[PDB]
Amino acid sequence: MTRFDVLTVGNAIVDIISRCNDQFLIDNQITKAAMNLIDAERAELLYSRMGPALEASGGSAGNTAAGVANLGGKAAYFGNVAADQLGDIFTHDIRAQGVHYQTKPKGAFPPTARSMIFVTEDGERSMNTYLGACVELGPEDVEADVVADAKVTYFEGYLWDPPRAKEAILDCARIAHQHGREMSMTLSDSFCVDRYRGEFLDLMRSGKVDIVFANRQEALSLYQTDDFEEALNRIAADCKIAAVTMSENGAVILKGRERYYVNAIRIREVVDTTGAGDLFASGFLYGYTQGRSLEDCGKLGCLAAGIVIQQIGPRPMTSLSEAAKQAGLI
Amino acid sequence: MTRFDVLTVGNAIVDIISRCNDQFLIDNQITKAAMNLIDAERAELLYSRMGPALEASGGSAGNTAAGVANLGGKAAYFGNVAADQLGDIFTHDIRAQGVHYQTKPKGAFPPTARSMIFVTEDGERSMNTYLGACVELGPEDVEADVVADAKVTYFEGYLWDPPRAKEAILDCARIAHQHGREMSMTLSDSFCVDRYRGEFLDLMRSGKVDIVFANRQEALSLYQTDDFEEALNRIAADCKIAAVTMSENGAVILKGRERYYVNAIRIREVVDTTGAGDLFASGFLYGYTQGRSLEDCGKLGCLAAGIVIQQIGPRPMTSLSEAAKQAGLI
Ligand SMILES: Nc1ncnc2c1ncn2[C@@H]1O[C@H](CO)[C@@H](O)[C@H]1O
Ligand SMILES: Nc1ncnc2c1ncn2[C@@H]1O[C@H](CO)[C@@H](O)[C@H]1O
Known part of the structure; x- marks a missing residue:
């Protein structure tokens, strides 16, 4: 028995969420469906144009850790906030879900990261992120005992944007693998893949990363191809296990020459896609650390992802364990 | 023409919202369906026990002003926040809705008011409010030109809790009535009625207040009676116009010997009752300042209230003007 099933590491962010029309994205030169990095001045400008909003704790890996805990797994999180009200919100929400979260703020400035997320009528989300205190995440924030005691340590490609987070990740990889973890x-x-393509491929090929999550667009970007079949063949050669999501078309899990396709759940209405991939990873990694088949890990991922896109905000407000039991995935 | 249809005045609050079971309220000695005032220490304690939450700008009168603006009316708001992140959220959300909001923060301490609102499975809401910077609202915050230029100035009974807000209200009443406003x-x-019953009746009988909003429970409390008919007769005698809401049973508008009964709208589900009364007041006052019949004012109020209870959070995220046009109230 170990202390943790899943440790996740990412940019600690509070989401500021509002609905907009498609013209808003065009007028403001916001790339639709993407994570758009912004500076403090641009954050002020976009906020001044944004409608009334809702705030909810976010951060891709933060959401994944919360989802693992929700399902009943034992989760931990590394991510840096500031000693401010937004940081206090972030700290409360992740700890309240039962995730181990002990990363200490280094003062009030830079302030806690926030992402202005604009949800269009089709339910797509376009994020505009000021990294703030996330730039300070570094090797000093690695709780070595936690990495050692976690079955899987999972991190964001997004961590390659701030300057020193990658150093923490390399430390994690060393500790995890020395203790026989993944x-x-x-x-x-x-x-993000466009920015760090070579670095990401090296993480995979050197064996620093064992399990890779991608959506279709990311997989295509990774190999700069329009051929999805090529992308699947190549990603399977580059990592031990790959889990590739395809929105409404479900998911495919690859291991060597093995492929396991999983259907997406049929949806009432796509309210807000924010968190879909994050919660797919929650379901997959919960299943994986419980010793479930790759297909069942995919099923658990699709179930969690389907739930989160039917609500506003990135972390399911309902019980994923109850949903999984009803679905016979238990 | 005037600059404003409705000026509202209230405790400026950010809501922190979570779902709980009925046992949580009992264990924490939270009075169900009520506004429970709390100190800083109790706020810390309750927050430590609360699940993951979402944040949304609140404040009863704030919500009402936002609803008037949503419907197409010209609104203003007086309420005091701190110079902090929660205050910045509050300031953004109300201004983004098109409400005039110019009350200046006086410092960072006390911090911006917040209310932990626990929503039970029946959709009832139980609020736990630390007033923070709201204790600083006073006569200095009265923008006399705004009061003079507003058709109706509307305020919360809740303002009798902080120490000096009532002085601002008395100043508002004087300026309003000197300019022929209501x-x-x-x-x-x-x-709140239990605490300030005598003062509230004095406001009405002296004519400082022209139009009074109450729900059934408040009306009964005002006259300490179990007889709703008595309460209606007495409230009609004590104020020029009374609007009394009765939840699923709609509302009754009273003027002198006149009575206008209005039905509740049909609804999908009671998701979260937070804001119901606030938005009834939005609909009513919007109608009133557009010269509509008392019955139509009631119908607009019931429409807005019915909309807000079908969503999480206190301010409608959909267009009230569009809904009013579709319902034929225009
Ligand atoms: N640069 C970033 N790094 C990590 N997470 C992010 C970034 N920008 C936005 N997010 C998060 O992505 C989540 C959706 O997957 C949102 O909850 C949001 O907080
Ligand atoms: N003491 C208070 N004064 C004014 N508004 C309040 C108070 N406590 C809670 N509220 C607000 O009541 C609203 C619902 O009517 C919520 O949005 C919440 O912010």
């Missing part, structure tokens, strides 16, 4: 990453966003 | 209040909460 490392996992998400490719996070197609433009 | 004053309105809501009784806010049955325990």
Whole structure:
């Protein structure tokens, strides 16, 4: 028995969420469906144009850790906030879900990261993120005992944007593998993959990452191809296990020459896609650390992802364990 | 023409919202369906026990002003926040709705008011409010030109808790009535009525308040009676116009010997009752300042209230003007 099933590591962010029309994205030169990095001045400008909003704790890996805990797994999280009200919100929400979260703020400035997320009528989400205190996450924030005692340590490709987070991740990889654990990453966003393609492939090929999460766009971006079959063949050669999501078309899990396709749940209405990939990773990694088949891990991922897109906000407000039991995935 | 249809005045609050079981309220000695005032220490304690939450700008009168603006009316708001992140959220959300909001923060301490609102399975809401910077609202915050230029000035009974807000209200009443405008209040909460019964009746009987909003519980509390018919007869005698809501049983508008009964709208589900009364006041006052019949004012109020209870959070995220046009109230 170990202390943790899943440790996740990412940019600690509070989401500021509002609905907009498609013209808003065009007028403001916001790339639809993507993570758009912004500076403090641009954050002020976009906020001044944003309608009334709702706030909810976010951060891709934060959401994944919360989802693991929700399902009943034992989760931990590394991510840096500031000693401010937004940081206090973030700290409360993740700890209240039962995730181990002990990363200490380094003062009030830079302030806690926030992402202005604009949800269009089709339920797509377009994020505009000021990293703030996330730039301070570094090797000093690695709780070595936690990495050692976690079955899987999972991190965001998004961590390659701040300056020193990658150093923490390399430390995690060393500790995890020295203690016989596994490392996992998400490719996070197609433009993120554009930025760090070579680095990501090296993480996989050197064996620093064992399990990779991608959506279709990310997989295509990783190999700069329009051929999805090529992307699947290549990603399977580059990592031990790959979990590739395809929105309404479900998911495919690859291991060597093995492929396991999983159907997406049929949806009432797509309210807000924010968190879909994050919660797919929650379901998959919960199943994986419970010793479930790759197909069942995919099923658990699709169930969690389907639930989160039927609500506003990135962390399911309902019980995923109850949902999983009803679905016979238990 | 005037600059404003409705000026509202209230405790400026950010809501922190979570779902709980009925046992949680009992274990924590939270009075169900009520506004429970709390100190800083109790706020810390309750927060430590609360699950993951979402944040949304609140404040009863704030919500009412936002609803008037949503419907297409011209609204203003007086309420005091701190110079902190929660205050910045509050300031953003109300201004983004098109409400004039110019009250200046006085410092960072006390911090911006917040209310932990626990929603039970029946959709009832139980609020736990630390007033924070609201204790600083006073006569200095009265923008006399705004009061002079507003058709109706509406305020919360809740303002009788902080120490100096009542002085601002008395100043508002004077300026309003000297400029031929009307004053309105809501009784806010049955325990609030218990605390300030005599003062509230004095506001009405002296004519400082022209239009009074109450729910059934508040009306009964005002006259310490179990007889709803008595309460209606007495409230009609004590104020020029009374609007009394009765939840699923709609509302009754009273003027002198006149009575206008209005039905509740048909609804999908009671998700969260937070804001119901606030938005009834939005609909009513919007109608009133557009020169509509008292019955139509009631119908607009019931429409807005019915909309808000079908969503999480206190301010409608959909267009009230569009809904009013579709319902044929225009
Ligand atoms: N640069 C980023 N790094 C990590 N997570 C992010 C970033 N920008 C937005 N997010 C998060 O992505 C989540 C949706 O997957 C949101 O909850 C949001 O907080
Ligand atoms: N003491 C108070 N004064 C004014 N508004 C309040 C108080 N406590 C809670 N509220 C607000 O009541 C609203 C619902 O009517 C919520 O949005 C919440 O912010």
